[PDB]
Design a protein around this ligand. Structure first.
Ligand code: VH9
Lengths: 300, 237
């Protein structure tokens, strides 16, 4: 079990660590989060009490280094940093634990939610979409735009999500215009899975990664990407049976975890109704269709 | 964006543009089978691709053989239309290729856009106008060439005959749409108006009769009466 200590908490802030969130008051004696499960990526995220504008946060994996948070009064935010001095870090953490100034990551033992949301999400893989090579952790916020958004403006601050576009030469073979537009299997299986992603694991991970940035930061371009990757599968007549089964599980837990009050903005009516009721895979997402119908029957 | 009453003079500027109408591409008769079920039989169709400034009409004849052994023909028809329009554009010299293609039915937008991916600078546009191009098969010479075709064939016409020698494109298009609107609302009456006077003939190289300027005004007035009438006979007014 790993720890992310905080130097201090000088401004009132709501802190998230994965799907949990708690409030810290201005200058409250808070010095971090302990008992963080090893083996998963994690995200620690922030919404200031005074400006709910900009949710922001950091993706990290405690196996890749010792990380801590320190407020910067010049740039006005909580920043993640790496401590390279291992002895210094263990000392800091042990002292804060002894003084019980750290909250307990409240994982329930029955609960596989976070695993199920991050099954194919890896810090090294995340780095290929959020480019900042001098750090082992990755910053994301509400406002960052995607490479594809930048095509329709600062590239260093972009989400280099894989670009998917159903009316593009990459998607449409010359001479197969109608075939390829109405059945996207060749774009899914040859172009994307065999040529770019390399396997279903990488496809699923970016899709999981896109969802989590949409949910935790309200990142609109990430929401577009999540729905785009989903639609590409549902609109393919020929999908490996193992992929469909896994997709149904992935989406189930994503819909399960979504705040009920954010469904209006985070769910695209057209994609979901097409995927669940019109597409080739309309009968292949039993768990996802059941939870959608019981939890958001209005959207449909 | 979409083409409507507001931006109507753009049709007659000097940027090459084509209207594409797919109404008459897939044409069927519906009939009973010996067992008392219903079946369709296809007949020849055509794509109606028209330069509204010059009157040049690219009439691509769609032979019934293209549907043989195919499913979902109404959907295929839209993609076949887009394939043939794309082929036409590629066949034209660069300086004759259109800068815009306006489709008369919105369901042609995606098929045409996908077929024209090689031409990113050609704008594919819908329209809010309810244009009467479905009535093209009420023009006897066009109907004749479509029904007689034994193979796929493109036939080139000027739908304005020689009118542009005496009138502007805007006026010519207005005359054409009025004639076609009339033929669409009451074909028999429309055709009666056009031929009543045996002394006015259709030149071998023309589609419409050789009316003088004065006779066109009379003709045009008779077509507007017909259209308002049928609008009464239809709505009772
Ligand atoms: C980078 C290349 C397209 N495959 C990796 C994929 O992008 C990916 C996978 C998992 C993630 F958590 C984030 C991204």
């Amino acid at each position: 079990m790993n720890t992310v200590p905080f130097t201090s908490a000088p401004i009132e802030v709501t802190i998230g660590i994965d799907q949990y969130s708690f409030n810290v008051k201005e200058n409250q004696p808070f010095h971090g989060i302990k008992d963080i499960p090893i083996g998963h990526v994690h995200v620690i995220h922030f919404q200031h009490a005074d400006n709910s504008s900009m949710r922001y946060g950091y993706w990290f994996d405690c196996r890749m280094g010792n990380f801590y948070i320190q407020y910067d009064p010049k740039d006005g935010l909580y920043k993640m940093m790496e401590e390279r001095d291992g002895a210094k870090f263990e000392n800091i953490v042990h002292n804060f634990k002894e003084r019980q100034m750290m909250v307990s990551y409240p994982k329930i033992d029955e609960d596989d939610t976070w695993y199920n949301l991050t099954e194919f999400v890896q810090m090294d893989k995340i780095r290929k979409i959020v480019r900042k090579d001098e750090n082992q952790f990755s910053y994301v916020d509400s406002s960052m735009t995607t490479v594809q958004e930048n095509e329709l403006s600062d590239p260093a601050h972009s989400l280099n999500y894989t670009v998917i576009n159903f009316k593009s030469r990459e998607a449409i073979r010359p001479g197969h215009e109608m075939e390829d537009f109405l059945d996207k299997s060749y774009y899914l299986n040859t172009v994307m899975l065999q040529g770019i992603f390399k396997n279903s694991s990488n496809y699923f991970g970016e899709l999981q990664f896109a969802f989590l940035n949409a949910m935790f930061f309200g990142n609109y371009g990430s929401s577009l990407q999540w729905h785009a990757m989903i639609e590409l599968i549902c609109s393919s007549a020929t999908v490996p049976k193992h992929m469909l089964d896994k997709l149904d599980e992935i989406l189930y837990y994503q819909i399960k975890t979504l705040p009920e009050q954010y469904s209006d903005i985070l769910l695209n009516e057209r994609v979901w109704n097409i995927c669940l009721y019109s597409s080739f895979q309309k009968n292949s997402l039993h768990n996802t269709e059941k939870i959608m119908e019981n939890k958001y029957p209005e959207l449909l | 964006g979409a083409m409507n009453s507001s931006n109507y003079a753009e049709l007659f500027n000097n940027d090459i543009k084509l209207f594409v109408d797919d109404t008459n591409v897939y044409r069927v008769t519906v009939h009973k089978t010996f067992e008392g079920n219903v079946a369709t039989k296809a007949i020849n169709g055509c794509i109606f691709t028209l330069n509204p400034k010059t009157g040049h009409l690219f009439l691509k004849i769609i032979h019934t053989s293209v549907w043989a052994g195919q499913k979902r023909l109404s959907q295929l028809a839209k993609w076949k239309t887009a394939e043939e329009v794309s082929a036409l554009v590629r066949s034209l010299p660069k300086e004759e290729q259109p800068k815009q293609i306006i489709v008369t039915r919105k369901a042609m937008l995606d098929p045409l856009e996908v077929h024209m991916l090689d031409f990113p600078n050609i704008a594919i546009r819908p329209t809010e106008l309810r244009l009467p191009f479905s009535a093209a098969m009420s023009i006897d010479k066009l109907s004749d060439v479509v029904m007689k075709a034994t193979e796929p064939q493109m036939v080139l016409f000027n739908i304005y005959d020689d009118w542009l020698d005496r009138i502007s494109s805007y006026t010519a298009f207005s005359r054409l749409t009025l004639l076609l609107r009339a033929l669409k609302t009451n074909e028999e009456s429309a055709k009666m108006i056009l031929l009543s006077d045996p002394t006015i003939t259709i030149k071998s190289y023309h589609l419409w009769p050789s009316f003088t300027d004065e006779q066109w005004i009379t003709i045009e007035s008779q077509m507007r009466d017909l259209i308002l009438t049928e609008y009464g006979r239809k709505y009772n007014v």
